[PDB]
Design an enzyme around this catalytic site. Structure first.
Site, PDB file in Angstrom:
ATOM      1  N   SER A 167       0.827  -1.196   0.000  1.00  0.00           N
ATOM      2  CA  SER A 167       0.000   0.000   0.000  1.00  0.00           C
ATOM      3  C   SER A 167       0.867   1.253   0.000  1.00  0.00           C
ATOM      4  CB  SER A 167      -0.885   0.012   1.254  1.00  0.00           C
ATOM      5  OG  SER A 167      -1.762  -1.101   1.280  1.00  0.00           O
ATOM      6  N   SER A 197       2.627  -6.887   1.714  1.00  0.00           N
ATOM      7  CA  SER A 197       1.524  -6.212   2.374  1.00  0.00           C
ATOM      8  C   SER A 197       0.202  -6.442   1.610  1.00  0.00           C
ATOM      9  CB  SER A 197       1.907  -4.730   2.441  1.00  0.00           C
ATOM     10  OG  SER A 197       1.137  -4.017   3.381  1.00  0.00           O
ATOM     11  N   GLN A 198      -0.465  -5.372   1.179  1.00  0.00           N
ATOM     12  CA  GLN A 198      -1.708  -5.504   0.426  1.00  0.00           C
ATOM     13  C   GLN A 198      -1.430  -6.333  -0.836  1.00  0.00           C
ATOM     14  OE1 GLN A 198      -3.967  -1.912  -0.456  1.00  0.00           O
ATOM     15  NE2 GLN A 198      -5.148  -2.983  -2.030  1.00  0.00           N
ATOM     16  N   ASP A 257       5.397  -7.998  13.447  1.00  0.00           N
ATOM     17  CA  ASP A 257       4.713  -7.411  12.303  1.00  0.00           C
ATOM     18  C   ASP A 257       3.262  -7.794  12.535  1.00  0.00           C
ATOM     19  OD1 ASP A 257       3.552  -6.535   9.993  1.00  0.00           O
ATOM     20  OD2 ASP A 257       4.904  -7.532   8.630  1.00  0.00           O
ATOM     21  N   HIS A 270       7.223  -4.388   9.959  1.00  0.00           N
ATOM     22  CA  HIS A 270       6.529  -4.489   8.674  1.00  0.00           C
ATOM     23  C   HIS A 270       7.359  -3.835   7.591  1.00  0.00           C
ATOM     24  CE1 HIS A 270       3.103  -5.129   6.075  1.00  0.00           C
ATOM     25  NE2 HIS A 270       3.043  -3.854   5.741  1.00  0.00           N
TER      26      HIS A 270
END
EC number: 3.1.1.74
Length: 196
Positions: free
Chosen positions: A26, A104-105, A159, A172
């Site tokens: 993201s 991530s996303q 994370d 993260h």
């Protein structure tokens, strides 16, 4: 180089043997973000420039952080975009081995797309790397409909996205070393396991 469109720009008459499709996190830039370029250069070292095509997921995938809250951890438009890239790869280069990854996303996007993909194309993905996998707890560290042996999840201690939270903590943002060593190492090993 945060933008790579080797698949889209590439000549079907001269297809690469390996096509890597990657989804950024993201808010990241280009279509590769922060981790993609590192994996890419290492893949190019192993297979050579003309041997591997690096393709980030751009187009409709805006990597909007708000979309992390949607049912699948990303939007429908984004999944459609990544599915279309796997489909473009399959038709443009029938004999290429595919490898994928997401951060991530982008990791949720990768898992969602892979889950929805036709089994014939999905079997072609020799390995998938997921960093800071947002659906790690919910999916029990797996990508639905995809074998555990072809999956490698990089989830740091601390994370929070890996344990069901949507909070962004320091761990993260600490996947740089993984993208430089174990991630491409895993992908290369899986490709060589099938291609020799």
């Amino acid at each position: 180089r945060t933008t790579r469109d080797d698949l889209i720009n590439g000549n079907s008459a001269s297809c690469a043997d390996v096509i890597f499709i990657y989804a950024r996190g993201s808010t990241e830039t280009g279509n590769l973000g922060t981790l993609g370029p590192s994996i890419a250069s290492n893949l190019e070292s192993a297979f050579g420039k003309d041997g591997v095509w690096i393709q980030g997921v751009g187009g409709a995938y805006r990597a909007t952080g708000g979309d992390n809250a949607l049912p699948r951890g990303t939007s429908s438009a984004a999944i459609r975009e990544m599915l279309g890239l796997f489909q473009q790869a399959n038709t443009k280069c029938p004999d290429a081995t595919l490898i994928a990854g997401g951060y991530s996303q982008g990791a949720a996007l990768a898992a969602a797309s892979i889950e929805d993909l036709d089994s014939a194309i999905r079997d072609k993905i020799a390995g998938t790397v997921l960093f800071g996998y947002t659906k790690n707890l919910q999916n029990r560290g797996r990508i639905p409909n995809y074998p555990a042996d072809r999956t490698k999840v990089f989830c740091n201690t601390g994370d929070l996205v890996c344990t069901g939270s949507g909070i962004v903590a320091a761990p993260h943002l600490a996947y740089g070393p993984d993208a430089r060593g174990p991630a491409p190492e895993f992908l290369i090993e899986k490709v060589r396991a099938v291609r020799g």
